[PDB]
Amino acid sequence: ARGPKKHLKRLAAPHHWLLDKLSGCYAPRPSAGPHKLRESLPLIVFLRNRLKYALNGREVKAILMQRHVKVDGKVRTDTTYPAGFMDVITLDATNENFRLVYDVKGRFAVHRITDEEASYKLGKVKKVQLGKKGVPYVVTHDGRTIRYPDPNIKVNDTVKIDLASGKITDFIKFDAGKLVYVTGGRNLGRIGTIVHKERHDGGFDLVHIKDSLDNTFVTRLNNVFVIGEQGKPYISLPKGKGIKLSIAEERDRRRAQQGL
Amino acid sequence: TVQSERAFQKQPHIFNNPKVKTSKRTKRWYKNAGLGFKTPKTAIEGSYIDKKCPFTGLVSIRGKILTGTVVSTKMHRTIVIRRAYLHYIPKYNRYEKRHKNVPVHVSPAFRVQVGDIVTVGQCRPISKTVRFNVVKVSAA
């Protein structure tokens, strides 16, 4: 090519959006924004393929232009604005508040939360540096920079952000035995706790995570998102709570539950 | 000997004040390479100047790590390494031998004759055909 690309074809669209392969020829292509391309979800896949409120594209623009939909206490009208992990989607004419978080089979789940949990947001720590005129800042996974932190924060920790003023309340370190979400790969959406973490110099470091039913697995370091101390998260988890169920176990658990 | 080239030779931005006097020879500068590698004795207290050395020059080491035997030392500050493997052919269920030569760079801290076996690490492009330089050595 010569410049940037601007169309996304239909079969090349990311799989966990679940667009059906016969309705059109192209998919929505997500704008450049806070979250990466194949790790996010536009506002048109939310408002017509999950909540079933709108039936077209022409209906979604009619919703967005009435200035209903906010993200993180700020109004958006970009019809493919890229909402990603841990974002808060506050409609107003229904008094519903949502939070983007992962399913267990690997999907973005519809999650309703309260009116008080929708005042804050976690975020991990991607780098910490010394800026111009000697002040330091910190970069989160969604790209917020925040100057003047505590000195005890290091990288791969987790901050808590107040969405009103854009500030920090407290923070969680990163060591053995913590509650951890997994945000990328194969064991995607499972919740467990840290056994220990071995390190390879000049390579990709591996953590070992134990479930609650005590079965273990291994992922790279960067697909690991700290949530809280053991038995106590800071957010409202979905049903199943990140427990991997074998396919044998979930036929008959659907069978015996089938009593309607 | 160390001044044979037609322009003056120095680790740049390393200043000697003649007004002061201190019984050191010259303020040499030297770094630690990383990855559990050990800077040799003859680099910290040696007297050569080389632009492209891992312990003295301005190159980094990152990327791969290889290993192989040295088969030609006929250039000035480069050698050639031979590497040997096998290759599997599925229909016949068997292996066949192959090889590839790589050229690397040799700092004058090391003394490498033919027949030895070195380990080498990767740096940014040094010449037309060079992307590695030696970081350890073990004899024959």
Partner: protein, 188 residues
Amino acid sequence: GISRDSRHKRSATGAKRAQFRKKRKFELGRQPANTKIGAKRIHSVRTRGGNKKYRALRIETGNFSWASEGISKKTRIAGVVYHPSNNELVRTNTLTKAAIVQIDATPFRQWFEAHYGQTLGKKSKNAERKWAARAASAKIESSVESQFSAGRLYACISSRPGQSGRCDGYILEGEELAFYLRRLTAKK
């Protein structure tokens, strides 16, 4: 134009390569600017991105630097004596990096008397109050003051003039000067 591809050379084997695409704009060269001495002529070229470079077509002054004292003043330049790449730039007096020129020594000498009060070669009470302070740091190397009778120092250029536009540098000192002066008066 001048392109910087490696697709026109031969392999490490000697095998002659093949014509693969047409010539791409993002591998280009421009023309070498030779930098004469004279009145100020500086032209601006436009680069990748919206940036800017200043080509110097001829200039005459600079901004040179005394290391051991730590003072950098603005002077004039006179002519090049030595260039280690080819000696067809000394016979034309271009201006590259690593070129060895001569400057006029006047504002360094005029600074030196103001800082110390001592001559080179051969009255308020504030002044000798602090001239007495800078007493031990008075003397310098012999072989560098020994050209203050002529006002022609020896200095090398450390800025690329074809890129940055300017032409600055630093004074030769005795360790480096011992090398070049043995090179200067023997290779001719």
